[model samples]
Target: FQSNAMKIGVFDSGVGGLSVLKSLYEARLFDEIIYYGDTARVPYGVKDKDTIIKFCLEALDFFEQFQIDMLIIACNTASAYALDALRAKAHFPVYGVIDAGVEATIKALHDKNKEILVIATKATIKSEEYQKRLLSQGYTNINALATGLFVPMVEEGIFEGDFLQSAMEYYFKNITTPDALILACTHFPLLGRSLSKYFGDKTKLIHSGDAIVEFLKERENIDLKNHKAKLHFYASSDVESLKNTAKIWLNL
Candidate 1:
C-alpha cells in the first residue's frame, strides 16, 4: 500500500501549504511528503509577479535537496504567479493547486452565464487568473472577490467567532448571490463549514483540498502496510511555530 520509492514536494510562500498537505496525506496517496514554507516572507499575496517568481524559484532550488517525483505549488498566489514558469524549468512533473482547481471548476459548472463566485487573497483575484481561466472556456457571470485577511485568519486558527462571522457577512453582503463558489485559497477549506452556512446548500463550493484529494488518490495502488517513507518539514524562518502549527493541521 506504500512505497519509499515515491516522494512528493509541496511548497508555499507560507504555512498555508500545510492545508494542501493535509488533504494529500489524509487520503494516503503518498508514503512521504516534503513540505516547505517560506515563513520569512509570509505573504506572497502582496508581492508583484516577478518578485513572487523569484521567491518561488528559490524555494524550488531548496527543494532540490529532496528526491521528489513531483512538486506541488500549494500557495494559490504562488500557483497563480509562478506555476507556469516553474513547470518550464523543473526536472520532474510539477502540479499546481490552480491547475487542480481550474480543472475541477470546469467540470462542476457548464452554463456560461451561471452566477459564480471566487474567494481568494487580494493578489489572486487581482491577477485575474481564475477569472480568465473560467472565461477562457466560455464560463461567465463570474465574480472574483478578494478577501484580504481570511488566509491569516485561518492560519491563526480563527474560523468562527463574532469577528470572523462579521467579516464573512461583510464579504457576502453586497455580492450577487452565487450558484457556484470557489475557495481559491487552500487555507479557506478549513473555514468551509462557516462559509457554507453563510452561502447555503445551493452554492456549490470548491476548495484546493477537494482538488488535491481527487488528484492524488489515483496514484495509490500498492499495499501501504509493506512500505514506509520519510517525512521532513522545513520553514524559512521560525521553524518552531511552523513546526507546531503543522503538528495539528496535518495528521503527520
Candidate 2:
C-alpha cells in the first residue's frame, strides 16, 4: 500500500552514493531519507562477490534501525552483486540501480540494435549484470568496461584535466563512438562533463541517480507534489567528509 509520505533508506559503500541521494532529494517524494555510507570500507567495487554481500548485509542491519519503507542500494557494484541477497533477508522492498539503469537505457535509446557501452567498477563489469539485462532486452551491440580509476579520482574531486584525459584515453582507446554510454557507477557522474565531451553529442549518457528517480516514480504511488523531503547522513567513518560532500554535491 502506498502512503501520502514515506521514509526510505538509501545505502551505499561510500560517498559515491551521494549522486543517488541528490537525485532523490530533488525529486521530493519522501518525507525523510536515511542515507548510510560505509565510508570505512569504501570502494566495494574492488571486492569479491561474497565480501560485497557481507558488507551489504551488515549495512542492512544498520537500516533495520530506521524501519524505512524501502531500501535503495545506491552503489552500482553492490547493486550488481548483493541485490538478491539483501532482498532475501530485508523485510521491506529493496531497489537497486542496475535494474533502473537498464530500463532507463532501453527507454532512452529505444533502438534494440544500437551499440551501447557500460562503464563501471571492476566488480560491476565482472558481474555482467548490466550486459545480461541489456542482452535480454534485445540490445545486440553491448560492451562493458571497467572504469575503476574514476571512482578514486572522483573522490579526490578530480573531474577534468590531464589525469582524467589520460584515464579516458586508456579506457576508450579501441572503442568506437557508442550510441549510448551507461555510467554504471554513481561516482562516474561527477565526471559527467568530461565523459560527455569525450563521447560527444550522439552518445547518450545513462546514469544511476536520474534513472533511479524515474524508476521510483513509475513504480511507487507516492504524493510527489505534497511531500517535503529531508535528508539524514551517516557513515561508518569520517562522517564529516560525507557531510562535506553532501554540502557540495547536493548544494545544501
TM-score of each: 0.89, 0.93
Provide the lowest-lDDT 10-residue window in model 1: 219-228
The lDDT per prediction is 0.79, 0.87
Cα deviation of 84, candidate 2, in Å: 2.2
Every candidate's CA RMSD: 2.8, 2.4
Error of 2 at 107 (Å): 0.8
Q: Give the per-residue lDDT digits (tens) of candidate 1, residues 104-218.
A: 7766876677888888887888888888788888886888888878877987789898889999888778777788888888788778888888888988888787776675555
Residue lDDT tens for model 2, 1-252? 345568998888888889989888888888889999998997786777899999899999888877888999988888877889888998888999988999999999899889899998888888888888888889998889888889889888898998899999998897889988998888888998998898899889997899999998889876675645778999999998899999988787
